[PDB]
Amino acid sequence: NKSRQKELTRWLKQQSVISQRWLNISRLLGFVSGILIIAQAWFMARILQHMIMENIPREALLLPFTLLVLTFVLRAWVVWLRERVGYHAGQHIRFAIRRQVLDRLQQAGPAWIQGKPAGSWATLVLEQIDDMHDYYARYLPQMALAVSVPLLIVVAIFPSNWAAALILLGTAPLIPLFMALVGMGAADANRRNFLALARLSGHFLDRLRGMETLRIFGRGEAEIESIRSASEDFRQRTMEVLRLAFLSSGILEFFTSLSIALVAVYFGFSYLGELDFGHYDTGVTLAAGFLALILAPEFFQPLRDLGTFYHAKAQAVGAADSLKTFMETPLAHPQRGEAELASTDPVTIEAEELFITSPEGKTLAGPLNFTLPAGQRAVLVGRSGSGKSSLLNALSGFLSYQGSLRINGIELRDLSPESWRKHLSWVGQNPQLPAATLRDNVLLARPDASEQELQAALDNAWVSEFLPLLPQGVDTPVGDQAARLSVGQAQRVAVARALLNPCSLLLLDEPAASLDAHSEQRVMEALNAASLRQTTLMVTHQLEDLADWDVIWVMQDGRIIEQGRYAELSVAGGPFATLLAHRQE
Amino acid sequence: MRALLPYLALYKRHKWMLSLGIVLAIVTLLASIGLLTLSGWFLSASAVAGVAGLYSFNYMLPAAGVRGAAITRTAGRYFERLVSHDATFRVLQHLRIYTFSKLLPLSPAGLARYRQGELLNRVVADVDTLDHLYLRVISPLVGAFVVIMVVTIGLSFLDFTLAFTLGGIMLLTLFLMPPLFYRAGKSTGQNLTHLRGQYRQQLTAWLQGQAELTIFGASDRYRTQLENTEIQWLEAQRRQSELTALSQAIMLLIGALAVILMLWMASGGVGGNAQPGALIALFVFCALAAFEALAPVTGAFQHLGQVIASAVRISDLTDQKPEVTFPDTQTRVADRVSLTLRDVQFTYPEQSQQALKGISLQVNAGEHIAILGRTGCGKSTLLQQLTRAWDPQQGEILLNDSPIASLNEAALRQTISVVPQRVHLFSATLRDNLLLASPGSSDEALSEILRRVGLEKLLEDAGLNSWLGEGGRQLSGGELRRLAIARALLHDAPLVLLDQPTEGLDATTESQILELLAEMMREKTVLMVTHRLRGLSRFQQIIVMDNGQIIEQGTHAELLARQ
């Protein structure tokens, strides 16, 4: 869509205002290289005419040699500066673009990060942002040099010949035309190139994370064909992107190589008398021929470079399409909440016709009406897939909701995310350990915690009994996806996190998952004690033990169809008693 | 530098196009140099001839030379880019499948030595960088050198002193300048390869764990560490730019040196005659134009420092020896499987204690066995010994009274069905998440087993076509548990190892699934690890493991009597 491309180019160009001083210096330095090229050509042409035509011995020519040497040194110095000045323009912009993206990934949450594979986020942050460098470093300064330097060259040739100057401008207008018709599809070709790379990178890391399942079912031969297909789609996109660059560069070299030929042919013929129109009614000099022949490649250099860096701009437009979409899509809440509750006392949760929706838009939990007074603890009970973990993901600010869900009378949309999360700690379902060591994971809430308070969490969550089994004790690395630990051993490390920092709201999503009948009792007596210190909501399936929790919410198909205390519900029949009936057999 | 030898052998499978992309590079440079060299002499020779020497001086042959060299320059460069890039990106294909082929043979323990985000860097990013070896490290070097020889030999007819002077400046530059910048940029290329893989690891770990890091306020303090890697990464990118800037400056200064020397030296005389005539412009324009042969060589050895660093990373991965090997002896999959274990002991890598200490049980074909025990007592370590995840140490596992190490891998996978404790939901579709086991099943078979396990609402809307995992619909904890049961049910292997299959399911669904497993797994050997004492009266034996060793063994009725 050509309308989308202009939106991306407006977005790309807005990000270059950080390094405006860098781009302006490079434009100036590129223009100075234009003057130094003309000065170098004039001295070399003047020297050659003196030695060949007028036959002065070299011992007389020292001023033109000295000035030519000085021009070469100035040429090299400006080249050295312009390369470094160009890089700083690209680096500071790329560092700022990446910061904006990482800022929105902090606010996105797990629900919005799961909308793209983790290997496809990585290529969005690494490859797609790093591939806008040549758009800022090299292309933006070149648009001015593509107009200034070629005109500067030709003005220096009109005094010599008006025809040799017309030869360059004779072939010049075709170059901008062919650069655009060839590159009309170069931005979409790059967009599909980064789409195939993101698909290949996300596909690989998905098979790498689940490579244990692949080994179990013997998918060694099948997954090599899937990588071969993903890597071949990517190869054909890359060759499609590259073929435009080779075609565009070949066309621009065709006119550059043609123009040098005519300048050589026209001057070579003029000296022989077959042509007379070019010169200003005066004999053609050898210096004029050499000046226009040395400057013929340099008239198109600023134009060949623009064509070279034009496809660097198309690489940035293709790389910015997936970026701008991520920036465009709203997160779990329309506007970043700024309100924050003050007291650290237990919060009150109040729902009124609450609907919880996925990032795509599917409703996960139906109309939820409930009230949880401050300090009270509730239990979520129901069938699998009935929206119990969705409610706990809404209370954490991970999911967008439609109705009303007020914390201490404040809508959860309006609460400041960073401030709200400091009053909330919970154990997720299938919990993960992001840190390196086992101590680093238990101390995630506050790394600088006293050894006594670290020990209390380890003892409470029954983590201290298997510490001798570990080689480094509590400092042993847990590995990638907690491979060093068992499922039940990693579960108790997750429980240790939630009990270390007291908070206003404690959520629990099957906190005793994959624990035997004994280690579960050790954990539940810690969580039963920890559930009385603040407002608590626990999603469990051990219907038998919970004879003291303040209220039970039996959830079915996204709706709380039965709320009450365990005493009456166990004897009132209905969904809870039947659900408990299949238990305890 | 010697690490590139395994990858220079891949040049052989495309030796025709890769060598053609070098011949066309020499042809382009010879035509590019010839165009300026011939044009420069043509003007000077024409100027000396003047109007009087119109007929004597042949002005048609040089006029065709500049036109012919202008088309060879543009046509040659276009094709040498097409040929060299087309062949380079097909060598890149084999390099990526060959690298990926090594990951699964060393899955459970070999892959634990690496971090997943840094392995994603090697296969996807480091392979691409190592592929730069021919395009910009080899083709520029040998293409330039041949052009140096041809230009020097060609000019040697005119004058020996001038030819080796221009050749000496050019050939000396080619041999001692790239190594000088390689030694200068070798350290930067190692830091630039190391930090790109470090940032990708710290980013994917930061993104994947964003649920916990957000709740406990570690997102900002882990992003700060992530940002510090980028700062170092950007400095390595900056130091590379300093070398690129300085490399171009020196070539332009060396570019000046020959032009000045040719101007000065050729003035004295070309060919032994004091009046060179037009021959002065022949050497000056050759020196002015022949440097574009040394243009790609400038940064070639700055690519080399980063290519070698990548070559080390892939050579590290592809040279790992998997600790589990399989014979090539084809065998037919049995229909009934009974396994015996006798004093099987296993120590995990880089550990001192033993995860398994003398497990010994004999499971007859058709028996259903329940394994109980505390958490961390070796239950899921046992079930991976049966899968040949690792090799037991001074122990023995036999399938059907034959060693488990004597089974072909293709036949081993068909004799065992596993429900892992940690189910994985792949990014693929619902159909493709179930075609891992029984690839030949039809969509009716897939849709049938989905309703059997209770996932009838996965067939709603898109259904089988619907995308799952990251980038699609995510499944709940109980739905992921019943998707792994649907995979094992489709596999239909004689021996079935269930690792707490009814974990995270409520009372009603668990009974609904356990009843389903009772009829589906009938006449099949089942080793079902559980933590729930409910419904064990249907099991022939009960195993109670404590600290990696079997404590009690017998029928549920027997175990209750003995307390």
Ligand SMILES: Nc1ncnc2c1ncn2[C@@H]1O[C@H](COP(=O)(O)OP(=O)(O)OP(=O)(O)O)[C@@H](O)[C@H]1O
């Ligand atoms: N990759 C590994 N490297 C070293 N040790 C490990 C590794 N994986 C597990 N262990 C150790 O092996 C012991 C038992 O492992 P295993 O996973 O078999 O226990 P488990 O019975 O499955 O636990 P659960 O019942 O909670 O699932 C644990 O104490 C753990 O520390």
Ligand SMILES: Nc1ncnc2c1ncn2[C@@H]1O[C@H](COP(=O)(O)OP(=O)(O)OP(=O)(O)O)[C@@H](O)[C@H]1O
């Ligand atoms: N990202 C998503 N997109 C679409 N549907 C989803 C998504 N996440 C969850 N669901 C659906 O929401 C339903 C209930 O989700 P939820 O996990 O809250 O239920 P649950 O009671 O926690 O399940 P379990 O008890 O198995 O953990 C499931 O059927 C699931 O398919």
Ligand SMILES: [Mg+2]
């Ligand atoms: Mg859940």
Ligand SMILES: [Mg+2]
């Ligand atoms: Mg286990």
